[PDB]
Structure formats: C-alpha cells, structure tokens
C-alpha cells in the first residue's frame, strides 16, 4: 500500500515535469513519454527494475531503498541467508 502510493505520487510528479515544456527541443518527447504510453503492467514492471545494478528504471533512490530493505527483511523471514 505505502510503496505503490508513493510510487503513484512520484509518477504523477514526474509526469508534470515531463510535460511542462521542451521549448529547447521537442524531438525527445516520444522517448520521455513512452513511459506514460506503456500499459500499466509494463509500467510497474519497468518501475520495478532497480534490482541488481542495471539502473535504467526511473525509480528514485529513496523508493528503491525502501523496497531494497523490505526484500531483505522478507528473505530473512523466509530463511534465505
């Protein structure tokens, strides 16, 4: 609940800054808004690729760290050291 709520708020914010303006050059609009043009399943899938260090996801560092801590706690509970 908390993770997806903060993710949704930050995604709305990122949307706002994405379509503020590109007066310098507007050729990058397609790549900048392909995120918001992808359907929700792929949206969450690519928002959730901060595992490992590929780091192509637009997820911010604090939101990444929250799940990185929750996953370690869950693995400790599951008994995977």
């Amino acid at each position: 609940d908390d993770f997806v709520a903060k993710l949704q708020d930050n995604q709305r914010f990122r949307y706002n800054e994405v379509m503020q303006a590109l007066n310098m050059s507007a050729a990058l609009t397609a790549r900048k808004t392909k995120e918001f043009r992808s359907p929700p399943q792929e949206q969450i899938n690519m928002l959730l690729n901060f595992k490992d260090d590929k780091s192509e996801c637009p997820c911010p560092e604090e939101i990444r760290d929250q799940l990185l801590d929750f996953h370690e706690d869950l693995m400790t509970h599951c008994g995977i050291e």
């Binding site: 609940d1 709520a5 949704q8 708020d9 995604q11 949307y15 043009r37 929700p40 949206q43 928002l47």
Partner: peptide
C-alpha cells in the same frame, strides 16, 4: 497518439488495482 494518451497512466488507476 490519441490511443496511448487515452490510456490512463498508473497514477490515475485506483490504489487497489495498483497494489
């Protein structure tokens, strides 16, 4: 164009669906 804009981004979806 219009098709992908008329697709609501993840933030518009109700929170339980996002969960």
């Amino acid at each position: 164009v219009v098709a992908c804009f008329r697709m609501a981004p993840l933030y518009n979806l109700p929170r339980h669906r996002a969960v």
